[PDB]
Amino acid sequence: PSDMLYHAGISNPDDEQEFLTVADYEKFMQENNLYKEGARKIMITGQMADATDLIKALENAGYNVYPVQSMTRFMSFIEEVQPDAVINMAHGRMGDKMVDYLKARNILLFAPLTINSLVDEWENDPMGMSGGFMSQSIVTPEIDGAIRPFALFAQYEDKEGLRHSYAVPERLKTFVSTIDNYLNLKTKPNFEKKVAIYYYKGPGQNALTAAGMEVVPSLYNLLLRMKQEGYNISGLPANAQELGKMIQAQGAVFNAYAEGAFNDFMQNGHPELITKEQYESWVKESLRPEKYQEVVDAFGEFPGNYMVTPDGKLGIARLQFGNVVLLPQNAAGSGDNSFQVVHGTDMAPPHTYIASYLWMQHGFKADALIHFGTHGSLEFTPRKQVALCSNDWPDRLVGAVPHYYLYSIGNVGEGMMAKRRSYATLQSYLTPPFLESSVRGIYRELMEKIKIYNNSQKANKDQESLAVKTLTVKMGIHRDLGLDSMANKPYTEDEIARVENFAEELATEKITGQLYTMGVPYEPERITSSVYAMATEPIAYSLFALDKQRGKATESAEKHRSVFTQQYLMPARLLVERLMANPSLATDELICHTAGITPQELAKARQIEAERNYSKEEVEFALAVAEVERTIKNVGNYKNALLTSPEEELSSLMNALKGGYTAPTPGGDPIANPNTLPTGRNMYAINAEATPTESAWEKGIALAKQTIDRYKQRHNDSIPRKVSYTLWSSEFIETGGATIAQVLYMLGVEPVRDAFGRVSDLKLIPSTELGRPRIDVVVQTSGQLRDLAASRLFLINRAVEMAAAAKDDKYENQVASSVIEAERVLTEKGLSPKDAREISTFRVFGGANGMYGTGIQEMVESGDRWENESEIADTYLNNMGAYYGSEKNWEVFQKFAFEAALTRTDVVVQPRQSNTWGALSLDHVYEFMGGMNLAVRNVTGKDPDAYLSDYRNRNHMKMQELKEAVGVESRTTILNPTYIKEKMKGGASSASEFAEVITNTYGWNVMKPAAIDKELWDNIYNVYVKDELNLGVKQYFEQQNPAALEEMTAVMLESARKGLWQASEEQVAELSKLHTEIVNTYRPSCSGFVCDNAKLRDFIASKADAQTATQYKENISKIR
Ligand code: NA
Ligand code: NA
């Protein structure tokens, strides 16, 4: 039978009993005393493995089990039985009917995994799963809302030599305990549950941080909501300021060198004390001997050296209110100050990390674990990628406790690691609101001069050009665009057009305002501005495309930005305002009049759109029409969702804590994807076996052509010899694989799709069709991308090998030349000819030992531990020299392999997809891009070009230069009074952003000196040290967060000391005076720059007064 219920025989377990109706199975259970009155029911579906032991264990635990085998019509059994949970050995997806039933009934769905090998082989595999098997076992079920991808089943051999599937005995106990823990949340009273919450805090006196969120008020609101719901919370303070003071007093973390600080904390913070017996019992119960032996080898015997009493106990910092506990997250590594990774050894966490998590599991005996914000570091510990075993740290540290994780909708790429490696359930929260830059009144007279120039009918237009040039040079714009500043040499038409486009881009930039607090909606003005930002550009660009396709005079609007603003942006804004005033105007006649189409054309477009869910022009016309229709229709829904989301977040969190079901959702910020509202849902990703999709291919081709055209324009019509790429995960998920398309088109290879839409083969483009020589590529990746899509790397390497062997080309083949040069370089280094020939084709690289980052930020920000950039280049070459181009040579390190592949490199490309961060507001951007740039400059001896792929506007993707982007970001955010005044209405979390931006600016100046000017440092000094805008920022920093001001002053002084900034004596004196005054008044914060840099300390002391210097030195020496 194909649809049945099954069970194992009682007298004879070998043969199987089959039943066609639920009544027969119930009678069979009652005959054999398998039925218990009032017990909860569990249904088991699937065919991937043999589940006899699981059924027996669940029955012994005290449940009623229904094993159902039905591939298609399994909903009838579920509706007849009405279980309390569903366990699925998934192969594919179940459908929307299951999601509707789960939402209606509010029950859970689980999905364990199966391994098709022996246990010994599985425990030694560094990957676990990859490809179609991983897509069918993990990726697809997440679209239904499954949780806990736990590895349970494996295979064994008998005497004859036959493979048999079974369940590993050690995993079964943990799985059953987890099921019991999840089911007990529904019946236990709220007054008796115990909850643990984890937050992230900076060292010393720094503030709490999360991605775009104000942390302390959100925590206070959450605690108030929990107290209202009926939980046992006592001792809560009056307001959030008192909570912040208490957290600072009793919840701080310290670095290794600040012995005095935590020695003082031991006698004032009242921490939890752990003895040796408890720790040893917990370790024996939880971990394995070999991993603990590794920990002992790395750090020594218990308790270690960090926060230990003289008696021999360990101290844990926590803050407890009744049955709720708050804890900070410690460091997952060691401050050995050795920046080069040793190949062949992993990193084990110190004693404090393990002690905290084991005390949560066994000492506090928590019923629920919560991670508060984006993002922690638990899910980035070693070793395996997916399908973890008992040797992996996240699996052991999480245990069998329900796990919830608060995450932002703008960082979908990194949530998959938390979902798949720590078994967490994600809860989405919003992003900060958007507004206009309001800088149109500063660059107005320049626009008037340009307008006067454009309307001159004179044959000789030079004086107007001279006036425009004078105004441009006065404002310093010529440095951003790479123009000249000669006395009597007028500009040409193209340069003036570039200046006008730059100014218009400045005028229409969107910025973020005050940070987001849970339980508090935006201001009505911010609601209006966000709804304005979410709807204007789609309508404008779709109308422009529709006008272009019909053959209208769109050349002027495509050539100038002012014309486009005056012809397509203002009418869209007016229409959006009208629709926002009265949502009932959205009629088909309005659509047909706005798009200038007849109703029959609209019907045809709707028919085409429905069929796709014809020639190419019809398809694109229908797509534009559908975009216009959706954007017009959903304005009121946007506003309502924005107004209603904050309450839904708290309600969903409470429902999840009571053991309910959380609905799935996609990811992305509201501007890029409006389908992410309302929030409070669980995010999923795309299938990597179908990438690059049909839509991403054309965009990749266009971007590659734009890159080639720009390089030819800047270098006298010469094409590049080799191009470098960096691959990340979020843009891969949100674009469909456009960067891979760019790489493949640069090589000259195209994908081949089967009948199911999966890409599994490659084809060579003829040289005549290409119209240009082939160009070689080199690629670097991050850990998240390697986890998400590993087969695409194999495709890329295979494409490189295929293109290197193409002969009889009309144009030159540069891939073969690159291979020959790499082989020669390897030969001159002292390698065997066979090894050199084998290695001369490696082109995909990543972090050593499988780490997720580059490890270069720690070396750059330790200014007193290096002198030249060559040391940084060597460290970067060592730390990112592993190879990930094939499965048989997965994670193999060869000396000089990375260096030989970087020869003859001309361009560096970095993707960008989010509207919330830029080049100066994210540290990973400089960490990767500037590191690659520095390595290329050190290897080849010439500084390459740097470009950014702008995906932010899904209807208009483009390519931009790095220095222009830096200029735009600097002119729009940190030197803009509107941004500063909007930020000055927050707290400490808002105040940390300035220090973060200054640190990133210092890092960029270190990596690529030519991209940072002295005038930028001068402007920052004028704004933040002299207060030329008359905003009163010093008082704001004093009343909110002095540590940020200390950090900013220290960073500027370090830049002055290293020679990167050519400051004068007065500026140095003022900075030193301010730094010493703040440190003396408000005590040191002790970050890396302030309390761990001797040369900077001496430099600061030498520039100040003698008594002030002595007081500053004695203040510094107290913490060490
Ligand atoms: Na940093
Ligand atoms: Na990060």
Author numbering: 164 to 776, 899 to 1405
Tell me, in the authors' exact words, what the paper reports.
HmuS de-chelatase shares the overall 6-domain architecture of these class I chelatases, including the N-terminal “head” (domain I) and “neck” (domain II) domains, followed by domains III–VI, which collectively form the body. The proposed structure-based mechanism for iron removal by HmuS is chemically analogous to the chelatases in both unrelated heme biosynthetic pathways and homologous enzymes in the biosynthetic pathways for chlorophyll and vitamin B12, although the reaction proceeds in the opposite direction.
Cryo-EM single particle analysis was used to determine two related structures of HmuS, each at a global resolution of 2.6 Å. With the exception of a disordered N-terminal domain in the second structure, they are highly similar. In this context, density for the head domain in the initial single particle map was relatively well ordered, but significantly weaker than the rest of the structure. Notably, the ordered structure retains strong density for the heme group at the interface of the head and neck domains.
